[PDB]
Amino acid sequence: GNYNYLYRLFRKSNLKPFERDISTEIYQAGSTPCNGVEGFNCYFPLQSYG
Amino acid sequence: CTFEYVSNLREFVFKNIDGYFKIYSKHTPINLVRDLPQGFSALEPLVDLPIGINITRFQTLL
Numbered sequence: 001g002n003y004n005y006l007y008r009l010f011r012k013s014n015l016k017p018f019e020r021d022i023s024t025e026i027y028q029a030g031s032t033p034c035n036g037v038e039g040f041n042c043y044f045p046l047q048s049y050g
Numbered sequence: 051c052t053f054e055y056v057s058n059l060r061e062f063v064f065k066n067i068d069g070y071f072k073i074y075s076k077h078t079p080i081n082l083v084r085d086l087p088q089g090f091s092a093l094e095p096l097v098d099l100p101i102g103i104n105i106t107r108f109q110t111l112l
């Protein structure tokens with residue numbers, strides 16, 4: 001399994017044309033603040049292809 | 051680093067449309083010390099940059 005290729009799974013809004021987003025900010029999917037710590041409802045915005 | 055380039059009154063216009071950064075420029079000599087003089091001139095385009103970078107703030111440097 002090659003996991004070097006990634007895709008963004010979460011984002012507050014859709015991209016405008018030709019926009020490039022390389023940010024790694026932790027996405028808070030719930031009501032609990034993440035404070036930069038990944039976990040339940042606190043996800044790394046990127047995920048690897050299998 | 052996706053890009054790098056190396057080469058009175060000055061007027062510039064900055065817009066960001068579809069990830070393209072348009073910079074229009076113009077220059078002219080002046081003699082005034084209060085504010086920008088009254089008059090009219092046109093600012094031709096000088097740079098189009100394919101940044102594709104989000105913009106919500108800027109800051110000058112002097």
Ligand SMILES: *[C@@H]1O[C@H](CO)[C@@H](O[C@@H]2O[C@H](CO)[C@@H](O)[C@H](O)[C@H]2NC(C)=O)[C@H](O)[C@H]1NC(C)=O
Pocket residue numbers: 012013015016019104105106
């Ligand atoms: C560019 O980044 C700005 C952040 O500065 C985005 O604007 C934010 O959008 C969220 C969406 O919920 C708001 O909660 C913030 O208040 C906004 N902040 C500002 C300063 O406007 C903007 O959507 C981004 N745009 C693109 C195309 O990436």
